[PDB]
Each structure stands twice: as C-alpha cells, then as structure tokens.
Amino acid sequence: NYRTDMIQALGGVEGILEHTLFKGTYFPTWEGLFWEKLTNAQRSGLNQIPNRRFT
Amino acid sequence: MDFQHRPGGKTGSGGVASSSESNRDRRERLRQLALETIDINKDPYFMKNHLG
Amino acid sequence: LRATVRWDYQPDICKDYKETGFCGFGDSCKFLHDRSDYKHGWQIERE
Amino acid sequence: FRRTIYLAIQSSLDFEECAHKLLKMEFPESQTKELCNMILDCCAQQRTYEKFFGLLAGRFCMLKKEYMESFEGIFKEQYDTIHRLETNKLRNVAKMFAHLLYTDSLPWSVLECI
Amino acid sequence: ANPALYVLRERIRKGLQLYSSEPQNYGELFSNQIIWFVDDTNVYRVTIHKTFEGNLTTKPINGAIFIFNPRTGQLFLKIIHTSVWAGQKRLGQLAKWKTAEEVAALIRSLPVEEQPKQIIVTRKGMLDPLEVHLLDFPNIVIKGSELQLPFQACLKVEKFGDLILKATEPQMVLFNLYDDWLKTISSYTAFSRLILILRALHVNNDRAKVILKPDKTTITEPHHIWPTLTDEEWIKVEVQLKDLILADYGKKNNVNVASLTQSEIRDIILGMEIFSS
Amino acid sequence: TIEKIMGNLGAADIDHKLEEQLIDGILYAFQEQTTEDSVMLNGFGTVVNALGKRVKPYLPQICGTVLWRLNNKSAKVRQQAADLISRTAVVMKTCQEEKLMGHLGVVLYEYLGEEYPEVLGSILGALKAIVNVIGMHKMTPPIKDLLPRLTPILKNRHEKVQENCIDLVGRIADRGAEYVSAREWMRICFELLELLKAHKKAIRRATVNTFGYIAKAIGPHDVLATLLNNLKVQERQNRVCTTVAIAIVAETCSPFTVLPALMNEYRVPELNVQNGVLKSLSFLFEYIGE
Amino acid sequence: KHHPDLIFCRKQAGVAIGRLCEKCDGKCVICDSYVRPCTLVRICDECNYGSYQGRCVICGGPGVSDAYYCKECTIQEKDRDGCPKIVNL
Ligand SMILES: [Zn+2]
Ligand SMILES: [Zn+2]
Ligand SMILES: [Zn+2]
Ligand SMILES: [Zn+2]
C-alpha cells in the first residue's frame, strides 16, 4: 500500500512515463512491459549495462 | 567510478585460458621440478625414452 | 553551403574489443563494445 | 480533497506537521465536516489504533472552534451510524471519541446522544 | 509503418530489454459498467434511387453513427451532411476518421460521467481510423464482444430516421433507443429489449412493426425509438418481437423458434451468439 | 488435414480470397498456438510454399505480426517466430524481396543480443536460411559487418547455439572468403580449438568442415602450425577430431605441402603427437583414397 | 567406434531397405567412415517390416535417411555380408 500511494504521490503513471523514455518505445501500453564454470583475468568489475539502460 | 581502485587488468593481455593449458603447464612445472631433483641427485639411473 | 556542426569528437569504442573481438574488462568496459568501421562525423565533414 | 488529505497524512510524520501543512494549504470552512470524515476514515482504515489521528483531532479542536463543532456533530452522527462499521473500525472510532474526551478536546455535553 | 522507424523503435526496445507480454456486453450495462456502443456500420448510409432509364444511381444520403449507451437506452445518432457522406477519397478511412472526430467532439462536449467506461464496438472492419482518432475520447474502450447490438437498424425509428433524413448538416441527434422499455424494466432488460427491437427490425421489419406497434396505442414520441407502451404492453411487444426474431432465425437456419432455451432466447434478443447529374 | 490436402493437390485451385482467409486462419492458429506444435509450423511452411509467388502480397503483414510476436515476454513465442522466419526465408526469397529481406536481416542483427539460448539458436538458424536464400552481394549487413559481431557469439557454452553458429560460420567460410581478414579467420580458428571439446560429434564434424573451409580460403600454413601446436598440447579425451581436421586441411589443400611438416612433427618425442600424426595419416589416407 | 558384442543378423540381405537416424547420420554402417557412400543398405528381414519401421539400423533413433555402404567397404565388397541392423543379445 505504501508502494501504491508512493506511485500515486508521483503524479501518476502517465506523468512518470512522460519523464521517462516511454513514448519513444512506441508501445501501445505500459502493461505489457516486463523487466529482467568460468575463468577470467578479473571478475569483480562493475556492470555498466543496467546503469546504462537505466540512464 | 573508482578508476584507481579497479581490479587488476591491463589491455592487450588475452585473459585466462582453458584449464587444459593450465594442466599441461602444471605438468611441465612438475617435470621441471623432477628434473631439478634429478640434477640435484646426479643419478645416471634416470633415462628418457625415445617415446618420452 | 556552410554546414559546420560541433560534433562529439570522442568515439568511446573499446579498441581491444573492436579489433580482436574481446575486451578483458568485459562488463567493466568503460568504453563501449562494438566492432565497426563506418565513417565519423568529422571524417564525413572532411570528405 | 481525499487524495490531498491522504497524501498529506501519509507524508506527515507528526500530527503537528500535518495540521501545520493543512493550515498552510488553507482549506475553506465549508468542508470541515468532510475533514472530520477523512480523519475518522483514516483511523478506520488502521488495523491498530494510532494516537496520531487522535492528537490531530485534539489539535483541530484546540486551534479553532469550528473543527470542534464539526467533531461534535460528526460524533452525534457516528452514534447515529454505529452499526454500519465493523469491529476494529468501531474500536478505532471509540478510541477517537475517547481521545477527544479524556483529553477534553470535546465537551461532555454532546454525550447525551448516547 | 515506416521500416527504419521500426528499426529505431526495436533498437530502443532491445536497449531497454522491454517486452510485450500482452499480444457479456449486453448484460454488463447493469453490472456496474457503462457501455456506449460506438458503431460506424451505418456511417456510410446511402439511399436507393431509380431514374427513367434502366441504370440506378447512388444517392448520397445522410449517414448516422450510433452511440448506444445501453444502461439508459440512450441512442445518440450522430448525423452527417448530405454532401459529407460521399465524394471524399478513402471513405473507409477519411469519412470514418471524420465521424470519429465528431464523436470525440461530442464526447468532449458531454461530461466524463456522460461518457461511458467502455464502448461496445462492432467487428474490426473500419476500426483503424477509429483507433487513430480515439485518443480524444479514451474513457470508453472500443472492442467487439460476444454480445453486440444491431446498430444498422438503430436508424429504423420513424422520428429518428426523419431527423436523420431532413438534415443537410451534422445535426447529431440524440434520443432514447428504449424510451418505454426502460421506464418499466431494469437496465439489462432495457438493453435486451432495445437490442431485440433492433434485431427484429434487422430480421423482418414488417413483423417487428406488427410486434412493437400492433395498434395505434404504441405511438412513440419525437425523441423515442421503441414504441411507447405500458409495462404489460411493452412486455407483450418484446415477447412478440422475440417470437418473431426466433421465427425469422428458424426460417433462416432451418430451425424452430421454440428450439432455443430461455437464456439462449435472451441472448438472441440481446444480440449475443445463440439522384445524379 | 489442410496441409496434407495442399501437399496432395496444390494451391492452384485456391482463390485469392480463400487463400487470404486461410492465411488469416493459420495466423490465428499461430496466435493461439499454445503447445509446442511444430507440425502446424510445417503445415504453415507447406501451404505458403504451395502458394509460392502468390504470398508476395501477403508478406509484410505476416512479417509485422512475426516481429510483434518477437517482442514477447515469453521466450518460446519469439523462438517460434524465429523458427517461422527460418521456415519462410526461402519463400520470401522466391519473389526476391531484397529490401524486405535486408530490413529483416538488420532487425535480426539488432535481435542478435538475445539472452536466451533456444531463441538465439532459432535466430541463428533463421540467419543460416536467410544467407542461403538471399544471394551473395545482397544482404544487409554484409559479411565484414557480420563476422566481427559473430566472433564473441562463438564463445557461448550452449550446444544448440554452438551448432547453429558453427553451421553459419561454415556457410560463410564456404561462400564469402572475400570480406574477412585472415587474422580474424585464424582468430576464429583459435576459438574453434576450444570449441572442439563440445560433446556433439556433429558439432565437431562441422568444426572440422569449417577448418577445411578456412584452409581453402586463407592458405594452409598458419592453420597447420596452429593445429600442430594444439594436437600435442591436448592429450585428453579429444583431438582425434583435431587429427580429422588436419586430414581435411591436407586433403582439401594438396597434402604434398602438409606432409613435410607432419613428418617433422612425428620426430617430436612427446608420447601423443606421434599418435596424432599416425591418426591423421590414417584418416587422410582414407579420405584421399587413390 | 564399434563393439565386440551386438551382432546384427548375419542374414542375407533382401528387399527391406536400411534406414539411418540423425544421431549417427552420414557414417558408414560397417567402418563408420564418410568417404564415397556408394551402396544402399538392405536389412534382410522384419528389421524394417513391422515394429522397426522407419527406424535406425544403428543405435536406435528415429530413422530418417537411407543407410549407405561406403566405397571403401565395397572395395572388399562387404555390402553382400548381410543385414547390419542391430539385434540386441
Ligand atoms: Zn572493451
Ligand atoms: Zn565403410
Ligand atoms: Zn543411429
Ligand atoms: Zn536383419
């Protein structure tokens, strides 16, 4: 319920999607959207990709 | 971004290869250790065959 | 026909990934991972 | 009005901050009974009674008299409509009228409706 | 449908890794859901005329777009001009888009409570311009459900047909589809009776006229589509209309009028599945 | 039943409106294809291949619906759409819709960064079909714009992805040797040395075929030196396929050149390299015959 | 690639045609090579007729392709040796 009213306090889902890159995606709706033994020289590197896609 | 606190990695390296290369490198290192012990012993009883 | 445009003159492609197919940093690649050789904006403007 | 009231209530940490925010946003006095309505409903939604809403009701009584008269009229109306509410809802409304009366925020004169 | 635009959109979608998980009505009006049946199947309405020669010309008659709020039986017949229903290129797109723009202007003129939460649209035959121009009226979602209404016979009322015919401009008239069937029954029963009158008029207009108006006592008003009657007279007129519709369906499908059940007969009544120069 | 009737009689008796209704019906069937029904996929390919050149009006709405199903949350839906692309590439190129085929190749090039292996293998098989049906100087992106993208794909550990990618590299190294430098070709050989340890003998056989194609393309010197380094270094439950690949490198590229290097490599006393020389000799003699 | 057990029939080949699965496709039926597959495989019996219809004459997969003798085996003419479809014993 805190999540629901936290969404409601942000001016609405359409107001949030106006801020985000939603209309460039050209989806008809937001409701279909879904989010998602080895050797290497180094392994503790930071993943730039999900921060890049958040940006 | 912590550039000066990144893990150890340099460009133009190649990365860690397969475990078989490490296994045969370990076999070569054990061969060199065996040859070091043979040269320390100075034993003529050891011989290398034609087939290795 | 003056069409001088201030570009971004820093193509941050990974040079190790671009001509090999592999970067050692991988997920920690500060540059971007792509292997391509199309012309840049300043090179087309010189052309 | 309901959305603004509920968002200000859930945003406000204290009833002092809530009443100061409501006096900042300056609602007219034609809806003080609706203000008492969304006070009683916001305590009625609670599983457990919190003294936040009772202190807010007492502060509304002790700033201006019109909120106190609206609380008296809605207290008589709540006694008229006791049976519409469930057990924890009536528990929370009973704690509202308790925290109005042991804190002397409402008079005992309107209690002749019982 | 630009291809390079879709390449850019798909590059955006694969950069975001965002997917698309996403690839009755006559009875839902009394189930706390307002449905205004926006149907444009009578939008391209043209009369029939004959000259002194053997050739028959096409008369640009005034089209009527139906908006049927079935909870109250409110039939808004958005009329068109005589010169606006023919002549324009791409009449399945341009005239449908103009009718959808007029419907969106009417929805903007009406209140949001006057607008419905859903739209009982027909099958998707000309719904592309309607979905293009329905951004201004997004309160009612247009879809084709299992239960529809015969909106092609919504203009078969005498007063509504006369007001549609004697209009050289977009008059956009409003009336009651069931003026007397809603004053003596529920909302779902009123929608079923209006759909029964529309389906009987679509099946056989003479039997529908004899059922709804068996005498002169069922004369309706100037803003009424169904015949003005009492509770028992309206129930008898609806029962005779359902019997005539079942007889016409049995004659069409080589079946019996009494072969359908009570719920099947109610669904068949309600519209569900059982010159020139 | 409709697929068997179309395979028996044909689509010549089918009118265009009935064909459009049947296309809409089987597209609705692919929409509500909940199970793993490849039999209706084969029937789809059979009816569209019996339509032949008549599906060229039907092409873009089918392609748009397949691309719409390729935006799904479910992996198997996009997998089946890529399988339908793999089935329909030949009948797309029957009318030679080169711009549409290049556009779908660019869209699948964007789709190449898929995180699911069955979807990736279906995409790779679709690209195998598309490269086989377009023609050589007519795909977008070209081979030099594709094989650097294909180079880290071969580092995947999944077997179907490896099989389809090695098959696509086999078709590329068979036909298009004229776009990729020999440095990148022997880098692909360096990847295939690690890729020879796959469990599937068909994968290892196609790896041997790619080694033969690259030896025909770039010359047999550095690849033979690389395999002579690798064969003495393996010494495990592999490397018989390395001897087989060495035999194909010799046999496709004139074993008189290869034989002094193999004869000198027989003089290495490393206890398995002589067995590799003799195994490659036996395999090579069996391959060349007379 | 062979086994000391699992003899096939050693029965003289007739009109029942051999048939290979995908798991061992392209190999010879005798020496398992791939060089000039010359002679069609006949499997002598009910090895094709009946329950093992369209099946592998080797390991046991769904038989999809015609099994072939290679030219190296037909050099010594091992194609006349009989049925190569494996009967487990
Ligand atoms: Zn990099
Ligand atoms: Zn053989
Ligand atoms: Zn087999
Ligand atoms: Zn046999």
Curated annotation (Swiss-Prot), chain C:
Chain ranges of zinc fingers (C3H1-type): 8-36
Organs and tissues of expression: Ubiquitous.
Localization: Nucleus; Nucleus speckle
Superkingdom of the organism of origin: Eukaryota
Coiled-coil boundaries: none
Described function: Required for pre-mRNA splicing as component of the spliceosome. As a component of the minor spliceosome, involved in the splicing of U12-type introns in pre-mRNAs. E3 ubiquitin-protein ligase that catalyzes the transfer of ubiquitin onto target proteins. Catalyzes polyubiquitination of SNRNP200/BRR2 with non-canonical 'Lys-63'-linked polyubiquitin chains. Plays a role in DNA repair via its role in the synthesis of 'Lys-63'-linked polyubiquitin chains that recruit ALKBH3 and the ASCC complex to sites of DNA damage by alkylating agents.
Disease per UniProt entry: Trichothiodystrophy 5, non-photosensitive: An X-linked form of trichothiodystrophy, a disease characterized by sulfur-deficient brittle hair and multisystem variable abnormalities. The spectrum of clinical features varies from mild disease with only hair involvement to severe disease with cutaneous, neurologic and profound developmental defects. Ichthyosis, intellectual and developmental disabilities, decreased fertility, abnormal characteristics at birth, ocular abnormalities, short stature, and infections are common manifestations.
Protein name (Swiss-Prot/TrEMBL): E3 ubiquitin-protein ligase RNF113A
Species in which this protein is naturally found: Homo sapiens (Human)
Organism ancestry: Eukaryota, Metazoa, Chordata, Craniata, Vertebrata
UniProtKB/Swiss-Prot annotation, chain E:
Region spans: RNase H homology domain: 25-274
Involved in interaction with pre-mRNA 5' splice site: region residues: 1-274
Phenotype for residue 46 to D: Strongly reduced interaction with RNA
Record's subcellular location: Nucleus; Nucleus speckle
Tissue: Widely expressed.
Stated role: Plays a role in pre-mRNA splicing as core component of precatalytic, catalytic and postcatalytic spliceosomal complexes, both of the predominant U2-type spliceosome and the minor U12-type spliceosome. Functions as a scaffold that mediates the ordered assembly of spliceosomal proteins and snRNAs. Required for the assembly of the U4/U6-U5 tri-snRNP complex, a building block of the spliceosome. Functions as a scaffold that positions spliceosomal U2, U5 and U6 snRNAs at splice sites on pre-mRNA substrates, so that splicing can occur. Interacts with both the 5' and the 3' splice site.
Domain notes: The MPN (JAB/Mov34) domain mediates interaction with TSSC4 and SNRNP200. Has structural similarity with deubiquitinating enzymes, but lacks the residues that would bind the catalytic metal ion. Contains a region with structural similarity to reverse transcriptase, presenting the classical thumb, fingers and palm architecture, but lacks enzyme activity, since the essential metal-binding residues are not conserved.
UniProt-recorded name of the protein: Pre-mRNA-processing-splicing factor 8
Residues of the whole record sequence present: 1736 to 2069 of 2335
Curated annotation (Swiss-Prot), chain F:
Region (Interaction with PHF5A): 286-287
UniProt main location, coarse: nucleus
Protein's GO biological process: chromatin remodeling; mRNA splicing, via spliceosome; positive regulation of transcription by RNA polymerase I; positive regulation of transcription by RNA polymerase II; positive regulation of transcription by RNA polymerase III; RNA splicing; RNA splicing, via transesterification reactions; spliceosomal complex assembly
Phosphoprotein in keyword set: yes
Subcellular location: Nucleus; Nucleus speckle
Keyword Coiled coil belongs to the record: no
Ranges occupied by HEAT repeats: 140-178, 182-220, 252-290
Assigned GO CC terms: B-WICH complex; catalytic step 2 spliceosome; nuclear speck; nucleolus; nucleoplasm; nucleus; spliceosomal complex; U11/U12 snRNP
Residues with site note (Interaction with RNA): 165, 179, 271
Keywords in alphabetical order: Acetylation, Citrullination, Isopeptide bond, mRNA processing, mRNA splicing, Nucleus, Phosphoprotein, Repeat, RNA-binding, Spliceosome, Ubl conjugation
A GO MF term: mRNA binding
Domain of life from the UniProt record: Eukaryota
Modified how: Phosphorylated. Phosphorylation occurs concomitantly with the splicing catalytic steps.
Job description of the protein: Component of the 17S U2 SnRNP complex of the spliceosome, a large ribonucleoprotein complex that removes introns from transcribed pre-mRNAs. The 17S U2 SnRNP complex (1) directly participates in early spliceosome assembly and (2) mediates recognition of the intron branch site during pre-mRNA splicing by promoting the selection of the pre-mRNA branch-site adenosine, the nucleophile for the first step of splicing.
Family indicated by similarity: Belongs to the SF3B1 family.
Species of the source: Homo sapiens
Curated annotation (Swiss-Prot), chain G:
Chain segments carrying region Interaction with SF3B1 and SF3B3: 33-49
Molecular function as annotated in GO: DNA binding; RNA binding; zinc ion binding
Residues modified as N6-acetyllysine: 1
Interaction with SF3B3 as annotated region, ranges: 77-80
Any one GO CC term of the record: spliceosomal complex
This protein's UniProt keywords: Acetylation, Activator, DNA-binding, Metal-binding, mRNA processing, mRNA splicing, Nucleus, Phosphoprotein, RNA-binding, Spliceosome, Transcription, Transcription regulation, Zinc
Residues that coordinate or bind Zn(2+) 2: 21, 24, 56, 59
Family stated for the protein in its record: Belongs to the PHF5 family.
The protein's name in its UniProt record: PHD finger-like domain-containing protein 5A
Species of origin: Homo sapiens
Upper classification of the organism: Eukaryota, Metazoa, Chordata, Craniata, Vertebrata
Gene giving rise to this polypeptide: PHF5A
